């Protein structure tokens, strides 16, 4: 039971992995699109503890939290329905399945190129029986102008 | 010029939260210096502003000042005062001597405050009763930090502990961890007279109580201030006074360069390696 | 055994005069700790005992506390706070970070209190009038230490300076050196509006006045205490509060390792050598 | 005077093992300074004597000197060099500036050598193969200390690493942990 709308003017996203340029481009796009609040709520990076990272909302500075575990970000950001997974081909499967363990996420974008087809099949099966749409692996993502932008879609400003 | 015109954004590499000097007036954690002085905040209030960014109540500030007073100095025999005196007698300046003395402050010298606070907080947060806590410490062969002194014991108490304990009794609103430490002290003293609560253990438990019950901190804020080493800072700031006093004393006494006597050193060297 | 029986005499390698921990009670330069606390001698009184072996009057103790409060911190841009922040962001402990910040305290940073006191005392001890002192400093190519502010010029004075000046006026019995420094300040403000008495110069001259007029020190005792670096100790102890606050703040903000940008460094290396 | 007559016993409060200077000749851990110099030891040999009290072979001393050479400096941007420069520009003397720089050496800055050695030794001492070591470190969310470079990926190797590795190949008798780290 997928949804007919998946990017919105008030959508929020969790970025998996340490991709500062991608999320900064996301925030630049959000600011130019006259969004009330940034589209990236938090970031998940297993190799550094929970902290906050500086980013530019237009000309001012904001702090976006970074979490070791997807669980904490999932708990304290219940408004997030999109996850952009920058995990490599080796950890994209586990990260995607762990994200699908959470019902609030309706859209998962997978950027990694080179995921084995059987693991991708299992991802499709889990998403289909969980009602979660998947911007398929080996992609740049997608862009809804005025509402949301996935990763490095459409280049920089 | 570009920043003034707003044409350029460059990320700031530093964050600060304790003091702002850019404006007309100096500001201590969102509070102007004249406002600090006009309402009779002391060293304790300024310390609270600079270290916790909080407006501590008057009794908390007075207790912080008392903690700085009791740990000011404990003679020249301790490692830090020894090092400060050696460096002062070597012709070095105040900063170098005080620094050489301070660098010995760590696990063995001066770290009983933070270790005592951590252990008593861990024991109290878990449901173990004082007797169970003492038995569990005995099982692991780990000494209870903040318990036991050599010269002083029961019937000849440590008077610094008595002063601080009296202040906490008649001023603090609630001291759960202090009562827990007092029960542990009763158990250990019934075991053995010299195992009394130290100034280190008393300061640690009363500092945790002050953080948790002054009303200016949430549980996790007090926990993180304890964890990051606020009590290390308390001891270091207190003992810097005594170390500077020792440096000034050695400079005033015109003591010469120090060399350890050879008869006090046991030389044990390889045969020809 | 030989020492107990008195057969052997052995010179003591250390002399101390500030604290005695051997006895039943801790003693701060002849005053027991219970007497220290009963007499309501705050941090200023304990500092006086440990640094000068004198029981200073209450106004002197409060003035010392105020001097410690005004110099507690001055933002993170100064050299010492910068070094402390760098060391804290490198994951070091409190003692290492505070020490790394303190090691920058010297002639260019933090020595303005002692230098201003020495300069004004040297001028005042000789008979030269304030105008002769200003002209002599100008002729020697030396700026007057303790004179000059970046923004505070006239009708917007340095508020810390004003607070300390008010306390010194309404509490000190006699401040000849402060009056001399204020005449010098009048001359230099006639030259240029922002050449006012710093907090450094005010603290130096008021500390010399306190030493020379509190009634506890002879002239040579006060001169010796100024010479050996008592004001350096005052600044170091005061600024240690702000440095520990900066360390705790960087720890709480969970800041990461700092690396200075390559664009801010001018690499000028030999071509072949 | 009673000590010159053998009438008093006092316990020694300190123990030392690296250097004896009471006698006529300076001794570095059981070896006179003339003996140190006549057999063409260098910084590495004296370092071995003073730190380990051992007679390291010449290749070990040369390797220690090479390690001191490659870690001598890495520019002014690092935390320690930054602190040293800040303290030097503040007018402090050599000891204070070098001290302020050194005090930043710890976990985040300068501790990668000890951490890398510790974790590689802990892995190698256990029976886990390099692949299992990589997976184990990945599972715990912990990067491998000693792995990673901003540049110098492939066919443009880091050159200090190349020099040290070549020396260790051509002089060391056996390098088990080096081979383990190279498989990693
Ligand atoms: C202060 C201290 C160093 C003095 O220890 P001490 O002089 O060796 O005390 P003792 O002569 O009783 O010898 C140790 C014995 O008492 C017990 N003991 C000593 N300190 C203890 C403590 N803090 N907790 C529990 N048991 C302790 C030991 O189990 C040992 O028992 P045993 O004789 O049956 O083996 C020691 O109590 C200690 O390490 N305390 C913890 C650290 C601390 O508080 N620092 C000092 C703050 S100023
Ligand atoms: C170099 C100089 C100090 C010579 O020293 P000295 O005063 O003759 O003797 P020392 O300072 O070595 O020590 C005095 C004695 O105590 C002994 N002693 C030294 N250190 C000792 C220690 N830690 N424990 C016990 N005994 C010690 C020495 O064996 C020496 O023996 P002596 O009785 O035969 O003289 C003196 O000539 C001088 O000041 N010259 C100026 C040049 C200079 O400063 N050089 C720097 C030296 S590296
Ligand atoms: C080693 C390790 C930090 C690799 O770092 P990295 O993220 O690949 O690269 P850096 O952290 O050096 O910095 C990345 C960029 O900052 C730049 N940079 C580094 N120092 C700089 C400075 N002072 N000013 C400006 N830019 C700088 C680099 O040139 C690099 O440029 P790029 O973005 O064009 O590639 C990482 O793999 C790691 O932590 N490994 C653990 C093992 C370890 O710690 N090794 C010991 C270190 S010697």
Author numbering:
A (entry chain B): 487 to 643
B (entry chain A), C (entry chain C): 827 to 1099
D (entry chain D): 827 to 1010
From the paper:
Here, we report biochemical and structural analysis of an ACLY-D1026A mutant demonstrating that this mutant traps a (3S)-citryl-CoA intermediate in the ASH domain in a configuration that is incompatible with the formation of acetyl-CoA, is able to convert acetyl-CoA and OAA to (3S)-citryl-CoA in the ASH domain, and can load CoA and unload acetyl-CoA in the CSH module.
The asymmetric ASH domain did not contain traceable cryo-EM density for a bound ligand, but instead, the CSH domain did contain cryo-EM density that could be tentatively modeled as CoA +  citrate, although (3 S)-citryl-CoA could also be modeled. A superposition of the ASH-bound (3 S)-citryl-CoA/CSH-bound non-productive CoA pair with the CSH-bound non-canonical CoA reveals the mutually exclusive nature of these two binding states. If the ligand bound to the CSH domain is (3 S)-citryl-CoA, this could represent an “unloaded” (3 S)-citryl-CoA, which could not form acetyl-CoA and OAA products in the ASH. In either case, this asymmetric structure is consistent with the allosteric regulation of the ASH domain for ACLY catalysis.
